[PDB]
Write a protein that binds this ligand. Structure first.
Ligand SMILES: *O[C@H]1[C@@H](O)[C@H](n2cnc3c(NC)ncnc32)O[C@@H]1CO
Length: 149
């Protein structure tokens, strides 16, 4: 499928990887999600990534996928978990913020089996009407210095 904008929820089990992503403009995901994001990148004008650390209760910001996975990009930057991930790709964070899932009220995702937004696994796609609004709301918040600490 070809389209203008697509939106994916990214989960991280460690805050340090979010900090590394922000400092270096890089991400990597599971091998299966890497194929999904790669297919989206080559078929979509803009692939937006909405970042939510595990057990953080919400989103820390969003960014645009800028390149395809590349084994030569920052090899091994995540440590040994690199072995369980696809290759690294460039991401440009467009906003760092704090928005809790609870602030959005009850929201479910029709592209993810009617699961609550807060129950999204890594790589979950959201429909464009919802994804666009999530990015708009994030952009309208004050920027948060996530690297504080
Ligand atoms: O639920 C997810 C998730 O939080 C985690 N995940 C996926 N991709 C990453 C990265 N990329 C650098 N860093 C930390 N955690 C990550 O994996 C589980 C699924 O096993």
């Amino acid at each position: 499928p070809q389209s203008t904008k697509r939106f994916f929820i990214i989960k991280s089990n460690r805050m340090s990887n979010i900090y590394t992503s922000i400092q270096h403009g890089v991400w990597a995901t599971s091998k299966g999600n890497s194929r999904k994001l790669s297919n989206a990148f080559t078929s979509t004008d803009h692939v937006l990534l909405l970042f939510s650390a595990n057990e953080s209760g919400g989103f820390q910001g969003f960014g645009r996928m800028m390149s395809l996975p590349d084994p030569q990009l920052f090899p091994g930057i995540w440590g040994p978990v690199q072995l369980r991930l696809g290759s690294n790709f460039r991401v440009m964070w467009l906003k760092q913020c704090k928005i809790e899932f609870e602030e959005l009220g009850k929201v479910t995702n029709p592209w993810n089996d009617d699961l609550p937004l807060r129950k999204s696994r890594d790589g979950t796609e959201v429909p464009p009407a919802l994804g666009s609004l999530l990015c708009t709301w994030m952009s309208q918040r004050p920027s948060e210095d996530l690297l504080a600490g």
